Design a protein around this ligand. Structure first.
Ligand SMILES: Cc1cc2nc3c(=O)[nH]c(=O)nc-3n(C[C@H](O)[C@H](O)[C@H](O)COP(=O)(O)O)c2cc1C
Ligand code: SF4
Ligand code: SF4
Ligand code: SF4
Ligand code: FES
Ligand code: FES
Ligand SMILES: [Zn+2]
Lengths: 105, 93, 8, 434, 192, 687, 15, 73
């Protein structure tokens, strides 16, 4: 009821920049934009009161855009889709390292 | 002589149009044919030409106190886009 | 964090 | 003859000043026959030169033994705007080899005329001679010879009056064994670190300055004018089929009289040692192992040396190679394990460090060999050493990794009981002492 | 004690001016003339050798920067070249650099019998110059087959680039190397 | 099969395609593709350390070896070109054994310091050791060791971990354009370093942390602070400049831990600037957290929102309508700017503009303040003419694209403006408008070079927009463009480089300063994050209201402080230099009693008696649809509809004042950067 | 006499 | 005494670990490299760390903070 009207984002997390491997892509997630946390004034621990604090990154997952969109629309959430950025494969040659500079100008 | 008095009547004029759609073709022709003279006659009037991939041809005028009026340009010929401009300049301004 | 002497 | 090979006569020797008894400069060079009617050879054209080189059956004298005529024919027939370059490899840093040094010392005009001939045969406009940085006196002598050739009109514009323009420049290294590798040599000539390139591209398509380039040994270049003048059939009359021509041999180590000699290809190793070197010191029965050519080929045991011939194919058939034809002879008094460890240290020191298997495995092999020198190892570590050599071999950018793996493999293949005995004796000393 | 990095010092720091002498300018131009004008980097090795000859047998960082300026490259490439090749000395050596303690082909015939006597006569450890700045002992790197000798190498930097020589000596004995050092001190070029 | 990472493959012509087999499978690749690339098209992930798609092929790590039929040796897939009919095997015993041996060699001298290495948990070496070589170590000798090197306050160095992949050196030479890193020595003793003592001064230096596969090069300010598995990843955009670089914000609780680049082929190509990467420290420093009104003694006192809004609303009705001035900050999003414009226009004032040089330009035609070539389109240019702009310090990623184009396609660069340090060869053509007159009149080698250029590109900096002779400069530039056919239906080579993240949206929304001296005659000044405006021009008796998250000088002058959200704490719309519209994503909660900027403006408007016809950000965007509809059509590329011809002719004379420098300090450009330790240290040592 | 937006704004930044 | 230690240590009677480790004199080594395990029994210490001593400044073990210097040069 109260938590069924929240706005979410459907997206595919991109590849990290610290690793060259590509094995965590193709997954689709529903971001619940849970950004209400504070510090407990006893130990400094991070407290929250939002039930969807980590379910969107720990449990809820979708193999495709269509599945996530269908789930969001069945639950009634307002969703916006962010298309993922993909690399463009370009012709690369090891011979290019030794290209002739041409006649001196 | 109304074309030389647009600045006195409105603070800002906006023309929204599609870059490629046929429905926006009369508006694009109107811009290409009239913007030079309109801006030369009104050097201090902001005439914002804003193009968008899927917007209906529209035209907005902003007066004092932020009051605005809009005219839908769909199904209109280049001279009737000029009448609408004259009406916006002369009435409600 | 890094300590003043650089220790982890 | 076709049956037995050896006993090359003086009238068939190409390097007639190899012993430095005559003037190596221009006057003596022409008196010995160099620069003789080079105009006619140049005017014969590139195609004729390439065909004669192919017919002579000359193979690369830098160690790999690739057929020279085909390699020259790899050069483009029509220029695409880029010039063509010839690079002469005079960077012999391999231990135990001095043949190219002798050629530069005593027959430099042979090298220069061969440079011109190969440049015409490669449709190249300029030649760069890359000399070892330590051959300072040799380099100065070659530069004096080059000035003599330029003054006499034999090099430069309108070379030998043939209408062909050919420049010859002398370049030198700064003490790196890896710079002898052709792509590493090209990189060093470009002003970078001597790190070999991956193939493709091949130098005939993109070599020096990214232009078509052929890198060939000093010995290969210097014999081309003599082959052209005397005819390919005369050159092919020596040696077995596919191993034609004469070869510059140098024999060092435990022989009675070490020397550098020009001999017929496919000559028996034992005949070569007992004919020109006075035999193995202490008799042939005192022989233990022989490294046929240079330190970059595996050793062969005494039983193999009895009948093996000195050519590419015969030494290839016994898991060895002709290499630089630098014969190192070891008798029974040598600690062969210590020599192999020394070679491992050499390869660890000379690795350029570009690629992981060479860069790390060379040091690992050196450490294992140092431990095995004194038996401070386990019996199972010989197998681990073999697998490390196999992990290096074939996985590197250039052939230096293979040259590092080969001597250890040969030692394991031919003297494993010696290593096992050292390990057992070390263990026996360990048990009783403590 | 060769290191892959530089630590500033009073005789070795970037702010010290260093340029090719006027007499070396002819040689630099001739060296550059061997290569296309857009391939000046090709001259790094001969120019580094000439700078080492001019600077008494070693290369301060200022000389490397000067060479980088002549060939129009970033100094890091010249540092790479200078550190990759063993013939370049990046620390001071004496006017006469004595190179001993060869490698595999010569220690079979007992090569490690010359070095210790050389230090004992010179009264220095390997790699350090003598007090008068005349002699320093370094690592010899070998050619040939070591057949008829344990050998040593003498690099003569005492007279700049116009007096530079790089010679090998054969049959050197502990008595003979001291004799060579004595003729080098007296100025006579030892026979070889 | 889907390509690895969903990589797109573009074919110039289907005739220029070859056929190769990857583990029996048939795949089609363009001519010139490498074996590794063909494997990626097939969906097979080949392990690699030294290869990087944005850097020249090295082929030294030997980890990408595969088996190719009829090949005698294992083949380095990263360097070997693909051939028709080639049969590639990646999982044969030969390939697996080669990978195991190479991995064993890599770990031989590698230090045993995973628990203290920041790469732990996101390490390619760890993953490939777990996967490919699950071989029990058998190396028992002594490992080599390396001393650490000093590279500055940004890059922390532990060189024992380095695997000599040379990615950092090639990045320095090829992408950063600053040749400081090299590989010194030979053999196993070779060491990456600068030889001489020197710090990495390139503005793109921080990317070597990303590209280094091991923990040899790590972020010094981030050192030891967190593990990658405890960090929450938010995909958003940067607001340090007008480039809109895609970034990933890593947070733990209500704190941003680090910022790393996000792939976007059209903008930044997985690279970011050092300002973008290390400005996150200021987000938790000197934050305005509560509303404040200066007390009787002239000191700020904390109040509730209702009291401050009541004060501002009461005092805004006591001034003349022409005496109200509103200025939007460089970090403002489109929604807040639209709400501010509506609020100020509804009080009867037209003095709304965005801070910066482009405050009062002609915004009628969108071509006149955008990079019409597009950032990706720059790579097709054969000549660059830069007029009064320093892209290296104004738009770091645009300058990186220009440098990449110059390195690859040998494009020429002509520069007119004050002397500056470029990371690429470029002719200085002059320093001021006299050069522009000379270029227009011809008779110069660069004039015929520009005429002999197939796809020339002129880039005009927004810093020239505040000059008195702005119309003359623009007319001369457009005449130069027309004379050389710079603008064609197949090529738009005319470009204007903005400097502020908010500038493009502000110009689209019509936030244009009409009165050039309206600030000097104002009695009510609303500074919505405008910390870079000169506040001594404000009359001493004017009522100044400052709204923002930081502030140094405007905060001192302000009578009322309204705390506002930061870009990492809200969803806002930003348009970059090329007209590309993007949106931020909230990553962390706001601090204290802060509110979103548009919320504050709407609340004040309600308190002041003006009823705006929207109560949510969706209503604000629907309102924006009536002004700049391209601002709500996010993540879309659209070509220009109108060009220079519509501009009225100008006859203003040309002044002799030379072009000035816009960005004096790259690290000190906004209030967020001015509140960071790391940016201050960079200014201290790296400048 | 105020709309719900003003009450929510006085409450917090999360509506 | 520094900011790092003040985050957790609220007792000033004893020296902090940072001061305590700094008082241990550098260990002199014959050679350019030394391996540190942090304990006489390696299994009870920290993962073995090989430390280069080429620099004049004492080299610090990144695990236990022990410092080493070249004895002669
Ligand atoms: C480590 C290494 C060192 C080499 N050194 C030499 C050398 O000193 N001289 C030489 O001619 N070839 C040398 N080579 C072989 C060259 O790469 C190349 O095969 C040769 O220049 C071809 O000349 P050729 O065809 O006349 O034999 C070396 C190769 C390797 C891998
Ligand atoms: S095999 Fe050795 S010498 Fe050859 S490129 Fe690799 S590291 Fe360098
Ligand atoms: S880089 Fe760091 S995490 Fe990766 S293997 Fe080395 S020590 Fe472990
Ligand atoms: S520091 Fe990192 S990126 Fe640079 S060579 Fe070493 S491992 Fe590669
Ligand atoms: S001692 Fe033999 S080469 Fe030096
Ligand atoms: S990725 Fe191909 S050799 Fe390194
Ligand atoms: Zn320790």
């Amino acid at each position: 009821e109260e938590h069924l009207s929240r706005k979410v984002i459907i997206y595919s997390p991109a590849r990290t920049a610290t690793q060259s491997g590509s094995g965590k892509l193709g997954k689709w997630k529903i971001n619940f934009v849970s950004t209400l946390k504070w510090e407990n004034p006893l130990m400094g621990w991070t407290s929250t009161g939002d039930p969807y604090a980590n379910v969107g990154d720990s449990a809820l997952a979708f193999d495709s855009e269509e599945a996530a969109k269908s789930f969001a629309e069945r639950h009634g959430w307002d969703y916006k889709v962010k298309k993922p950025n993909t690399p463009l494969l370009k012709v690369k040659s090891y011979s290019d390292n030794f290209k002739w500079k041409g006649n001196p100008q | 002589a109304w074309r030389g008095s647009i600045s006195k009547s409105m603070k800002e004029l906006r023309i929204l149009l599609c870059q490629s759609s046929p429905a926006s073709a009369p508006t694009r022709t109107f811009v290409e044919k009239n913007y030079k003279d309109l801006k030369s006659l009104n050097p201090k009037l902001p005439i914002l030409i804003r193009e968008c991939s899927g917007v209906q041809p529209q035209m907005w005028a902003r007066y004092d106190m932020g009051v605005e009026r809009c005219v839908n340009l769909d199904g209109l010929t280049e001279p009737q886009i000029l009448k609408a401009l004259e009406n916006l300049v002369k009435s409600g301004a | 964090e890094e300590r003043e002497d650089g220790s982890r | 003859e076709k049956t037995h090979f050896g006993g090359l006569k003086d009238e068939d020797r190409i390097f007639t000043n190899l012993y430095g008894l005559h003037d190596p400069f221009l006057k003596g060079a022409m008196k010995r026959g160099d620069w003789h009617r080079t105009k006619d050879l140049v005017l014969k054209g590139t195609d004729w030169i390439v065909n004669e080189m192919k017919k002579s059956g000359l193979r690369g004298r830098g160690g790999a033994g690739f057929p020279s005529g085909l390699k020259w024919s790899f050069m483009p027939k029509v220029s695409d705007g880029r010039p063509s370059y010839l690079v002469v490899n005079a960077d012999e840093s391999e231990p135990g080899t001095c043949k190219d040094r002798e050629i530069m010392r005593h027959d430099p005009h042979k090298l220069l005329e061969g440079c011109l001939i190969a440049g015409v045969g490669m449709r190249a406009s300029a030649a760069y001679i890359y000399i070892r940085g330590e051959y300072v006196n040799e380099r100065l002598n070659l530069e004096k010879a080059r000035r003599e050739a330029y003054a006499a009109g034999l090099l430069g514009k309108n070379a030998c009056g043939s209408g062909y323009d050919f420049e010859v420049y002398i370049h030198f290294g700064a003490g790196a064994y890896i710079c002898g590798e052709e792509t590493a040599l090209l990189e060093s000539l470009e002003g970078k670190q001597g790190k070999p390139r991956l193939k493709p591209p091949f130098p005939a398509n993109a070599g020096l300055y990214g232009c078509p380039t052929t890198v060939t040994n000093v010995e290969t270049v210097a014999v081309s004018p003599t082959i052209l003048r005397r005819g390919p059939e005369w050159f092919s009359s020596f040696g077995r089929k596919n191993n034609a021509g004469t070869k510059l041999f140098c024999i060092s180590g435990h022989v009675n009289k070490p020397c550098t000699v020009e001999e017929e290809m496919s000559i028996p190793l034992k005949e070569l040692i007992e004919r020109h070197c006075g035999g193995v010191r202490g008799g042939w029965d005192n022989l233990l192992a022989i490294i046929p050519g240079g330190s970059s080929v595996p050793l062969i045991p005494k039983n193999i040396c009895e009948d093996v011939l000195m050519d590419f194919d015969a030494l290839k058939a016994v898991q060895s190679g002709l290499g630089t034809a630098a014969v190192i002879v070891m008798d029974k008094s040598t600690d062969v394990v210590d020599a192999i460890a020394r070679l491992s240290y050499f390869y660890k020191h000379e690795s350029c460090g570009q690629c992981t298997p060479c860069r790390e495995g060379t040091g690992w092999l050196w450490m294992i060999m140092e431990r095995m020198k004194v038996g401070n190892a386990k019996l199972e570590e010989i197998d681990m050493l073999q697998e490390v050599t196999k992990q290096i071999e074939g996985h590197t950018i250039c052939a230096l990794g293979d040259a590092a793996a080969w001597p250890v493999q040969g030692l394991i293949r031919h003297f494993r009981p010696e290593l096992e005995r050292r390990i057992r004796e070390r263990a026996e000393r360990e048990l009783l002492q403590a | 004690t060769a290191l892959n990095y530089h630590l500033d010092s009073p005789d070795n720091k970037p702010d010290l001016p260093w340029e090719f002498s006027e007499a070396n300018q002819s040689k630099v131009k001739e060296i550059l003339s061997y290569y296309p004008s857009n391939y000046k980097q090709s001259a790094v090795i001969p120019l580094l050798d000439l700078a080492q000859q001019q600077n008494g047998g070693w290369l301060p960082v200022s000389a490397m920067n000067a060479v980088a300026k002549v060939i129009e490259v970033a100094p890091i490439r010249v540092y790479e070249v200078a550190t990759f090749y063993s013939m370049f000395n990046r620390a001071k050596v004496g006017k006469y650099h004595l190179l001993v303690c060869g490698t595999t082909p010569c220690m079979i015939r007992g090569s490690r019998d010359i070095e210790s006597a050389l230090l004992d006569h010179l009264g220095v450890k390997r790699g350090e110059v003598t007090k008068d700045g005349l002699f320093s002992v370094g690592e010899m790197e070998c050619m040939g087959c070591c057949v008829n000798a344990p050998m040593i190498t003498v690099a003569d930097y005492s007279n700049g680039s116009e007096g530079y020589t790089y010679n090998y000596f054969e049959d050197v004995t502990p008595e003979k190397v001291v004799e060579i050092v004595e003729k080098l001190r007296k100025g006579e070029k030892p026979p070889h | 099969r889907n390509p690895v990472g969903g990589a797109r493959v573009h074919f110039s012509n289907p005739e220029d395609a070859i056929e190769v087999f990857v583990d029996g499978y048939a795949v089609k690749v363009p001519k010139g593709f490498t074996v590794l690339q063909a494997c990626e098209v097939a969906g097979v992930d080949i392990p690699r350390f030294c290869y990087h798609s944005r850097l020249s092929i090295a082929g030294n790590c030997r980890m990408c070896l595969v088996e190719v039929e009829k090949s005698p040796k294992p083949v380095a897939s990263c360097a070997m070109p693909a051939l028709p009919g080639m049969k590639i095997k990646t999982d044969t015993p030969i390939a697996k054994k080669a990978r195991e041996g190479v991995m064993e060699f890599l770990l031989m001298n590698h230090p045993l310091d995973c628990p203290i290495c920041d790469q732990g948990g996101e390490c390619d070496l760890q993953d490939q050791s777990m996967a490919f070589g699950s071989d029990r170590g058998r190396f028992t000798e002594m490992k080599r060791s390396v001393v650490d090197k000093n590279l500055g306050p940004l890059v922390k160095t532990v060189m024992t971990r380095c695997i000599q992949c040379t990615r950092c050196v090639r990045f320095a030479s090829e992408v950063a354009g600053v040749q400081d890193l090299g590989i010194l020595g030979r053999g196993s003793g070779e060491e990456i370093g600068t030889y001489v003592e020197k710090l990495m001064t390139s503005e793109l230096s921080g990317n070597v942390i990303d590209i280094c596969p091991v923990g040899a090069l790590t972020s010094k300010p981030f050192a030891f602070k967190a593990r990658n598995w405890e960090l929450k990843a938010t995909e958003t955009i940067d607001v340090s400049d007008a480039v809109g670089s895609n970034i990933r914000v890593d947070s733990r609780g209500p704190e941003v831990m680090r910022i790393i680049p996000r792939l976007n082929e059209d903008i930044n190509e997985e690279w970011i600037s050092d300002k973008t990467r290390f400005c996150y420290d200021g987000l938790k420093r000197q934050r305005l957290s509560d509303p404040m009104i200066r007390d009787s003694d002239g000191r700020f006192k904390a109040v509730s929102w209702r009291d401050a809004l009541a004060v501002v609303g009461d005092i805004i009705h006591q001034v003349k309508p022409d005496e109200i001035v509103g200025v939007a900050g460089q970090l403002s999003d489109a929604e807040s700017m639209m709400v501010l414009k509506d609020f100020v226009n509804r009080m009867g004032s037209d003095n709304v503009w965005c801070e910066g040089t482009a405050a009062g330009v002609d915004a009628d035609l969108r071509y006149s303040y955008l990079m019409n070539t597009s950032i990706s389109g720059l790579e097709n240019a054969d000549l660059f003419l830069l007029i009064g702009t320093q892209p290296r310090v104004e738009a770091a990623m645009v300058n990186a694209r220009i440098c990449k184009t110059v390195r690859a396609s040998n494009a020429k660069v002509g520069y007119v403006g004050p002397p500056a340090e470029f990371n690429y060869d470029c002719k200085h053509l002059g320093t001021g408008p006299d050069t522009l007159k000379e270029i227009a009149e011809g008779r110069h080698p660069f004039c015929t070079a520009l005429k002999n250029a197939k796809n020339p590109a002129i880039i005009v900096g927004a810093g020239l927009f505040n000059r008195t002779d702005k119309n003359a400069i623009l007319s001369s530039v457009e005449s130069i463009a027309q004379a050389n056919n710079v603008v064609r239906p197949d090529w738009n080579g005319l470009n204007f480089l903005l400097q502020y993240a908010a500038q493009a949206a502000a110009l689209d929304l019509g936030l244009i300063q009409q009165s050039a001296k309206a600030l000097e005659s104002a009695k009510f000044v609303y500074l919505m994050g405008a910390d870079d405006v000169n506040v001594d021009k404000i009359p001493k008796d004017a009522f100044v209201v400052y709204q923002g998250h930081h502030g140094d000088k405007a905060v001192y002058r302000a009578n009322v402080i309204l705390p506002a959200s930061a870009f990492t704490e809200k969803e806002g719309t930003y348009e970059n230099t090329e007209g590309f519209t993007q949106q931020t994503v909230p990553a962390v909660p706001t601090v204290g009693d802060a509110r979103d900027d548009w919320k504050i403006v709407r609340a004040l408007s309600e308190v002041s008696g003006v009823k705006l016809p929207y109560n949510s950000i969706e209503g604000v965007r629907s309102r924006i649809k009536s002004v700049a509809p391209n601002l709500v059509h996010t993540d879309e590329r659209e070509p220009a509809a109108f060009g220079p011809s519509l501009k009225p002719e100008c006859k203003e004379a040309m002044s002799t004042t030379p072009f000035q420098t816009v960005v004096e300090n790259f690290y000190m450009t906004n209030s967020i950067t001015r509140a960071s330790k790391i940016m201050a240290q960079c200014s201290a040592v790296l400048l | 006499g105020k709309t719900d937006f003003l009450k929510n704004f006085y409450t917090s930044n999360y509506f | 005494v520094g900011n790092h230690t003040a985050k957790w240590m609220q007792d000033r009677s004893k020296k902090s670990p940072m001061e305590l480790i700094s008082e241990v004199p550098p260990i002199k080594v014959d050679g350019r490299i030394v391996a540190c395990e942090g304990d006489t029994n390696p299994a009870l210490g920290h993962p073995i760390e090989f430390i280069c001593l080429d620099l004049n400044e004492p080299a610090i073990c990144k695990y236990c903070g022990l410092r080493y210097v070249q004895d002669h040069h």
